[PDB]
Amino acid sequence: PMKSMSESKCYKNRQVFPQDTNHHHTMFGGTLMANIDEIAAITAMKHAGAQVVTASTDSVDFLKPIKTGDILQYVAMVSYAGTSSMEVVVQIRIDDVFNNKHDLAALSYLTFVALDDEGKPKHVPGVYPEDDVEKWFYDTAPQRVERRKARRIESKQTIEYL
Amino acid sequence: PMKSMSESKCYKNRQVFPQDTNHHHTMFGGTLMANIDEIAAITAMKHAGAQVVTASTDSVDFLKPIKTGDILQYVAMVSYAGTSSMEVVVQIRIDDVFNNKHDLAALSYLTFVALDDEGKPKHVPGVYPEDDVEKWFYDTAPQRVERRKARRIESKQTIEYL
Amino acid sequence: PMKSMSESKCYKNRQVFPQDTNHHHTMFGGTLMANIDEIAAITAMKHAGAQVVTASTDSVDFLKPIKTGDILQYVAMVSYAGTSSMEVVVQIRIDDVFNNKHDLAALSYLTFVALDDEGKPKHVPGVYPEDDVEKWFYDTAPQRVERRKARRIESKQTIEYL
Amino acid sequence: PMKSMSESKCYKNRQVFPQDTNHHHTMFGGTLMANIDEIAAITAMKHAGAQVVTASTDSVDFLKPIKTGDILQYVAMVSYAGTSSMEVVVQIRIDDVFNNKHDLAALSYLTFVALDDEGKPKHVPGVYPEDDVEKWFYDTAPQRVERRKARRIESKQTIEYL
Amino acid sequence: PMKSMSESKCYKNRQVFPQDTNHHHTMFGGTLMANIDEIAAITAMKHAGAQVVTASTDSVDFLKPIKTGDILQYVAMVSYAGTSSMEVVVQIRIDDVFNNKHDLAALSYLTFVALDDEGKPKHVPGVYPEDDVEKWFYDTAPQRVERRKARRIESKQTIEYL
Amino acid sequence: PMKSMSESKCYKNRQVFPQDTNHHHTMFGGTLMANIDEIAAITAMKHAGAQVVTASTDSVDFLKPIKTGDILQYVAMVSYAGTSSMEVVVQIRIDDVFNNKHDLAALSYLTFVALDDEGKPKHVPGVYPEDDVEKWFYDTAPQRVERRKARRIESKQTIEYL
């Protein structure tokens, strides 16, 4: 059983406030991160139809500065479905309502595991793309996943050492 | 010059945290109201393509209790365009991911005014609906706007009286 | 059993901080509304001697800009007591400490329902005014309250339609 | 020039929210202190008719545990006025709306200095009490003051040694 | 049984954001004080090996204005250990990463009580200094402690009187 | 010109409050990420002697659930110094004050760029280790850095495609 990438796609529009920025009037990367995780977890929950935990934040690329009073659009979707886990891709776009432009300011990939009521890993549906963008993320997912798996081994060695 | 109710339609998915509730495990009306104004302001900004100020909160109807760990979907859209003002309707739905339900937990109507860079009221485009929901809010708007107009008078008597 | 409007009258002085503003050094409507609901709920709790829930924000009129560094005075009173329900009026004034001026910057009306421990609507005492202002809010409340009940139906039609 | 203690007296009712507490459902002392400073600054601003800075927090005595859902009443008053400095006393009471009790749960004393537009210490009016409580705080100030002054010296020695 | 002042010494580095300041770009004393309590309570729990409550804040001396984007270093240590109580001294330094200077911007003394699982005062180990700074606060605490005991009674009289 | 890993090592002790958790009494990963980014940026600033921007979050591995009332220790250090960039490793430990344990709950790597006052990349000193843990992170840095640079390209393609 399969769900589309659109089915669980979640949106979030926010305006960037003074309490969201640093001393440079530039948005705190940590605030951006917290929003990213919030939206992504909702997307993962919707796709799995279950509670989720964040296993890892695989990367956040901060591509463009985000200023006070900028309007952000966050798009989260499942880009990959393993057995009990999913990759969620979050796009952060600066949304300019004055010239109707949308610039890509941040890109993030996270990994969530679905759980049952007892906290055991839960099977999830597979996922499929419908448009060219979803397809891009879906098609590039398999290399990211194999990297995540290799990086898990490095973290394991690190933990074993400490 | 006109826009659809869709072009400016904004979404927001948020789960309900402790810091968002009262001691009863139920969501504080204040937090809910703050989310409403934020989302609606973004919508009016998209529609007017201009800065906005909230002129009034026409109403907030709390129709169902909202609990910690509930998943919220806010939908904001412009339901009416006057000269320089917009009515924005916000629907707050309880989104159940375990049984794929959606319930209407609250309903809010706001009025925003568009402004130029000098803080003067700006002309806005008109609005039109495309589906039966958009059309229900679009069709029922004219009475609400007049009731809003009447109530501005009542506020005036009151300011004068004090 | 009856209480004066003064018996439950509550006050709140607060300064307006950067975290309460948007990009234009102007107070966020949503923040003002959260403060309004908080103060109103305390007043209704005092009047009912019971836990309360906010059934509706009947209106918030934003009349004057509220700026960073402004001192706000909120006054909350019960202007109407139905069987289980209270209308609360909240006045928000900008308090100028340099020329002892007070300006009405916002006006709000909210509806609370008092509950027993098990969550069932509880009977509240009646209310009465003692001065000219209190009398004004009191005398105008029944028309607002009849509008509130009528609006409830519109909301019901909307829920039914959706 | 002189003012009563009552002319600058400030009130604040707030409910204690989950976000204000620690793991034991108990109000974070830090929160309480932030509220103290806020209400005290407003009071001192009123008295001095100027911008103010917190010179010192002379004490905060935590006397009764404050719990989630509690209603707090803060009362701030100038209990002493030197040349450019004001002592503000804040009383924090737990306000029980179920039985009309008010227990003193905290007491605090702070020192503010009034500043002119350029940042120099600004003269403030004298202060005088009108009721027995006001007289109590007013008459006991001289010992808190000489305790403040001796302690400024100790701070100086500490800075010097470091 | 004993512990050095170092064993429980806690550090906290934070940058000063817009949300932490008032309208003068300058750190809200309240924010400063919330951070103080947070770090000091951690040190006290570490030293006691138990839950703690804040009994009082004995003083906060605001020595230097702290501006937006400044880097703060908080250091908390136990400077005195009664039977069940601890004086904790918190030092607040402005950390300049450009010229590797540190300025003392605030100094604070708090008093905590250790509690057993049942909420009763719990005996704590004594404390000893190892360096010249630790010795300075250690050697000076007894005079502060006696000032604190005296001041608790004062606070008692105030409660009785009111 | 070179700095030890210890020279810029920054600590943060924090306790996990109700407002930091989700409905399962478990710390929000978003909150943990904000904290991570803050401490790491300070470490970056210390090492670089300059302002910094967060270029990317390379990973966050969530290894153990973190619960309310837990005490956290964050440790941030520069593990790699490129020309204008730094890798910062943040360790998050659950600190048990009752049995003196420290458990590794999360590990993160982030990448910062040093800027001059005009926003151009700035040269940073090199870094070197002094103890076995520092040496472990330093010695594993080269492989992560090369992975960072391969992944940046993927992101370039993705940006191009979109």
Side-chain angles (χ1 to χ4, degrees), chain D residues 24 28 30 33 37 51 54-62 104 132 136 147 151-152 154-155 158 161, chain E residues 24 28 30 33 37-38 51 54-62 132 136 147 151-152 154-155 158 161:
Chain D
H24 297 97
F28 180 48
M33 275 188 288
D37 185 56
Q51 292 292 330
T54 311
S56 61
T57 299
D58 314 317
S59 70
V60 182
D61 277 288
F62 300 97
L104 190 62
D132 277 319
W136 169 268
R147 193 146 79 249
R151 203 180 51 66
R152 293 301 308 188
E154 305 184 359
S155 284
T158 292
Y161 182 89
Chain E
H24 301 98
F28 182 42
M33 288 204 272
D37 185 61
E38 162 167 46
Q51 296 302 324
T54 310
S56 62
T57 299
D58 310 318
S59 64
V60 183
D61 261 276
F62 298 101
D132 284 318
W136 170 269
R147 192 140 78 244
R151 184 185 46 74
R152 294 294 301 188
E154 308 181 21
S155 285
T158 296
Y161 185 84

Side-chain angles (χ1 to χ4, degrees), chain D residues 148-160:
Chain D
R148 168 177 69 92
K149 288 186 178 159
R151 203 180 51 66
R152 293 301 308 188
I153 268 58
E154 305 184 359
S155 284
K156 185 165 67 67
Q157 291 189 35
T158 292
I159 293 167
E160 283 172 2

Side-chain angles (χ1 to χ4, degrees), chain A residues 52-108:
Chain A
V52 303
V53 296
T54 318
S56 68
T57 290
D58 312 321
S59 61
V60 188
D61 273 89
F62 295 94
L63 312 164
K64 281 171 183 68
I66 300 167
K67 282 73 70 82
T68 319
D70 276 2
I71 296 165
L72 264 32
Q73 187 194 49
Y74 300 80
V75 196
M77 29 164 83
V78 173
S79 46
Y80 173 88
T83 302
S84 307
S85 62
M86 36 216 157
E87 174 188 58
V88 175
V89 49
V90 183
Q91 300 170 66
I92 300 94
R93 284 152 178 167
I94 299 166
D95 192 341
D96 185 351
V97 305
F98 297 106
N99 345 118
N100 296 282
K101 285 186 165 56
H102 276 71
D103 291 354
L104 187 57
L107 197 64
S108 190

Side-chain angles (χ1 to χ4, degrees), chain D residues 21-27 66-68, chain E residues 45 51-53 117, chain F residues 15 18 68-69 98:
Chain D
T21 59
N22 63 46
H23 179 62
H24 297 97
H25 297 86
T26 296
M27 198 179 203
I66 299 166
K67 272 83 58 68
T68 308
Chain E
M45 301 179 138
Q51 296 302 324
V52 304
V53 289
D117 298 316
Chain F
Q15 213 176 351
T68 320
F98 292 104

Side-chain angles (χ1 to χ4, degrees), chain D residues 121-162:
Chain D
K122 187 173 191 278
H123 283 184
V124 304
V127 80
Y128 62 84
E130 280 174 342
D131 69 46
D132 277 319
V133 170
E134 298 178 354
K135 189 168 198 289
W136 169 268
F137 286 112
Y138 181 80
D139 287 352
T140 47
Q143 59 183 3
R144 291 188 296 273
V145 173
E146 285 134 36
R147 193 146 79 249
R148 168 177 69 92
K149 288 186 178 159
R151 203 180 51 66
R152 293 301 308 188
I153 268 58
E154 305 184 359
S155 284
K156 185 165 67 67
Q157 291 189 35
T158 292
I159 293 167
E160 283 172 2
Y161 182 89
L162 309 172

